[PDB]
Curated annotation (Swiss-Prot):
Shown part of the complete sequence: 44 to 167 of 1362
Consequence the record notes for mutating D104G: Found in a patient with a neurodevelopmental syndrome; uncertain significance
Subunit: Interacts with p53/TP53; the interaction is direct. Interacts (via CTD region) with CDK9 and CCNT1, acting as an associated component of P-TEFb complex. Interacts with RELA (when acetylated at 'Lys-310'). Interacts (via NET domain) with NSD3, CHD4, BICRA and ATAD5. The interaction with BICRA bridges BRD4 to the GBAF complex. Interacts (via NET domain) with JMJD6 (via JmjC and N-terminal domains); the interaction is stronger in presence of ssRNA and recruits JMJD6 on distal enhancers. Interacts with NSD3. Interacts with NIPBL.
Disulphide connectivity of cysteines: none
Cross-link for Glycyl lysine isopeptide (Lys-Gly) (interchain with G-Cter in SUMO2), residue positions: K58
Name of the molecule in the record: Bromodomain-containing protein 4
Gene source species: Homo sapiens
Length: 126
């Protein structure tokens, strides 16, 4: 069994910015979700080999996780906040796509997503 390469966190020719919205995404949004008691299954890419989930990357073709997002934010990978918000939403959606309704992982994603929504509701103006 094999995992795919992880999503990139560095791309020197991709234009980048540091903006107040991106700073909020790191200092408020990421930090709030990262410390949560349910964050630990989303802090790195899904290891389909160790978890014995050979169908994970058959179904999930746009993987995303908070470890990747954290590195992207710390590395100033993004141009704008929408790119990062999209990454969080990809992470949550993948969980709902792969898993069964009511599974523990889905309840964990829902708890994190609730906080995500509350924080991005107050994304500062640029
Ligand atoms: C998003 C996600 N994370 C995990 C998981 C289990 S154990 C672990 N440990 C880490 N990452 N330290 N992550 C799963 C999952 C799914 O969607 C399907 C089932 C398993």
């Amino acid at each position: 069994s094999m995992n795919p390469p992880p999503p990139e966190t560095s791309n020197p020719n991709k234009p980048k910015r540091q903006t107040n919205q991106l700073q909020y995404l790191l200092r408020v949004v990421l930090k709030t979700l990262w410390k949560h008691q349910f964050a630990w299954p989303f802090q790195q890419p899904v290891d389909a080999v160790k978890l014995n989930l050979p169908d994970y990357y058959k179904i999930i073709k746009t993987p995303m996780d908070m470890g990747t997002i954290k590195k992207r934010l710390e590395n100033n990978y993004y141009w704008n906040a929408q790119e990062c918000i999209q990454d969080f939403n990809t992470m949550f959606t993948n969980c709902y796509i792969y898993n069964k309704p009511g599974d523990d992982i889905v309840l964990m994603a829902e708890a994190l997503e609730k906080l995500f929504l509350q924080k991005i509701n107050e994304l500062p103006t640029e």
